[PDB]
Ligand binder design. Structure first.
Ligand code: LJA
Lengths: 412, 412
């Protein structure tokens, strides 16, 4: 029967730092990780900025010989995974290696690599395609390479559910442990879609902020002057662990994962429904899964992408799920500071949600100068808000009408 | 305790046919779907052949306008999914739509779309990238588009575990139903990687058969003259259904899904370990999950890719799991006929495992003219073998050492 699941380790690369504590300090100080992109010429592009990981050194983790074969999304995935496993204190042994798996996902995976090899194919010929093209680019190889490096023989898989990937990865990993398929899972996501096809593709859909002259003010969830999301890069990994297993080894427990919801919108390939009906179904699934009264929810880490339709749909969904309690909880979008890490969004945001529980503080929504029509909740505008938080919720929504909710609470 | 899961609907595109009965007819006849690839310049490539879907008419499923927005891999997934649902006779209503979900996956995703958009990007710049590039290319859009078309509001996600995708998708969909998270799931996978990037990428790793002179003899699992896998395209979808729900509406039940196994090799990025230790753990996990003794297994649909290391690893693994029963079971590779559909391999091979149960026949391993050293099992060489089949296994072993096993049993 269903076992309980706690968080014993976390790891991160974000536009705000090369680990969790450095990223969290930026979150709490309301710092932007958004800047003009330096790693390519974007003068032909309508969007020329985003949340880059600054000063990442893959040789802190892996030999340059192996790193050369791997897309940045995999490098980012392994970095955050190695941080999480070390943060857990867990020792992999012959006695437990079959009971430790990994579920690290990505929305797009190795787009930079596929682009670079596409360039080789068209400019030279197929003889110049890397022998490492396939294993160095496909989405399941964060899970693959992590298992090879650490000797993890448990369930080994990857989700790809677009901007919901991190939330789904973590939730389904928790189910694996809940149901006895594993005692430990490394789960989250990673993304590096800042290449020509990535910025060009989101640019073609007119989905991205074009505020090139003030990139730090571009991401403004629920602000009336918002004009699309800011594309960001990085990784979040969490060590999920069966409660008694964690207790038995004296693990430090950050928080308990008590609820997981999924639901499809079945509305539109890319647009959310204005009323937030799919997000509402998903949160209600997650709160019932947690055995909670919705009034127990203190803090929501919103999806909060800074799109016109997305932001308002989320207000509608929260008001519909929480009624008058929608005015008592605190909801913020850390995307105001990090931008939108796509498949890694749910992973870093799950970590920020856990850290809101540890430090009893709601992260700010920076740049919320003029809340839009109907955006009249506590959105923690401008400055972090210290407050009681026993129960934190993290929402993700994606293309395909795919929805995910994680519910975390303090563990005593 | 756990709900029982049955198969009520199947759909397929393969190199053997545009549906299940045409495909299955080819399988039992020992027909190859392998031929030189047409309408594509492979002059500079070391491999010029594979398993194409011949004569696919997407307008049987979608408007020309909707189909223009979607990669072939998505078109193929949608075709299989629509066939499977139609095959199941299921009626979606307001009363059940929240209990019907989708998990359709892909190993490699939208290479053909990425290729054509790269052409435009390098030649003319980013302003010629399609607006539908991103949603028309990402792996979760088969689940997304299917959920929107049929109004499915259940769990909506997509796996990507390389050549293990289809097996994992079906297995995890079955878990969703068993543990009460859904009553119906559409699950499987699709693949169209017969582009320059697919043929080039696998060709650069020298993973492909280069037997251009006799394409139909190229895929020869366990034969001493095999020289790598044959790249194939298509889709498999199954309607998975909770038994009481199936019985209540008078569903036709093909077979019961009784066991699902996952494992990681934690060995190498593309090669299995010689003794197939990971595949052996996976199969043991699957049988434990089914509450079955290895002696009860009658038929195994092998991974059987026709790679030197892969084929021998699977023989070691079966001999280890099945001891004195290893020769009594029949094991065949339908990849001898279909080639390797990568992420859709596990989906179409699940369907072939179910039909071996329905028709009491082991499909052949064609081209097994000279079994290699140690390949002395009943590999059903050349011709289909009528026999008793109560319990059928389907194995997938993928890049990153990710393993999947499905156990199907006769239902009456
Ligand atoms: C035709 C022949 O005799 N030899 C040969 C040798 C190397 C490369 C190729 N061409 C290729 N597309 O791989 C052909």
């Amino acid at each position: 029967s269903r076992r309980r699941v706690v968080i014993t380790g976390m790891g991160m690369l974000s536009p705000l730092g090369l680990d969790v504590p450095s990223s969290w300090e930026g979150i709490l100080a309301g710092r932007s990780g958004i800047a003009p992109i330096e790693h390519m010429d974007l003068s032909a592009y309508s969007t020329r900025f985003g949340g880059s990981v600054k000063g990442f050194n893959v040789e802190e983790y892996l030999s340059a010989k192996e790193a050369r074969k791997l897309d940045l999304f995999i490098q980012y995935g392994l970095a955050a995974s190695f941080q999480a496993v070390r943060d857990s204190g867990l020792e992999v042994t012959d006695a437990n290696r079959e009971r430790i798996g990994v579920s690290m996902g990505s929305g797009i995976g190795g787009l930079t690599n596929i682009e670079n090899n596409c360039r080789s194919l068209f400019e030279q010929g197929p003889r110049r395609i890397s022998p490492f093209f396939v294993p160095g680019s496909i989405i399941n190889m964060v899970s693959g390479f992590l298992s090879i490096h650490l000797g993890l023989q448990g369930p080994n898989y990857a989700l790809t559910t677009a901007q919901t990937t991190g939330t789904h990865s973590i939730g389904m990993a928790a189910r694996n442990i809940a149901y006895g398929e594993a005692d430990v899972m490394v789960a989250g996501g990673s993304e590096m879609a800042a290449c020509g096809l990535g910025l060009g593709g989101f640019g073609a859909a007119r989905a991205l902020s074009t505020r090139n002259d003030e990139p730090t003010r571009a991401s403004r969830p629920w602000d009336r002057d918002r004009d699309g999301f800011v594309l960001s890069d990085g990784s979040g990994a969490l060590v999920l662990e069966e409660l008694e297993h964690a207790r038995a080894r004296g693990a430090r427990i950050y928080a308990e994962l008590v609820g997981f919801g999924m639901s499809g919108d079945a509305f539109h390939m890319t647009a959310p429904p204005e009323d937030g009906a799919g997000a509402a179904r998903c949160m209600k699934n997650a709160l019932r899964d947690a055995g909670l009264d919705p009034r127990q929810v203190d803090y929501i880490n919103a999806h909060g992408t800074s799109t016109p339709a997305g932001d308002i749909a989320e207000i509608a969904a929260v008001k519909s799920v929480f009624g008058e309690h929608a005015h008592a909880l605190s909801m913020s979008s850390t995307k105001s500071m990090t931008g939108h890490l796509l498949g890694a969004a749910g992973a870093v945001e799950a970590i920020f949600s856990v850290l809101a529980l540890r430090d009893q503080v709601a992260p700010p929504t920076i740049n919320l100068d003029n809340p839009d029509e109907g955006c009249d909740l506590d959105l923690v505008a401008h400055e972090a808000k210290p407050r009681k938080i026993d129960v934190a919720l993290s929402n993700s929504f994606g293309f395909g009408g795919t929805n995910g909710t994680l519910v975390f609470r303090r563990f005593a």
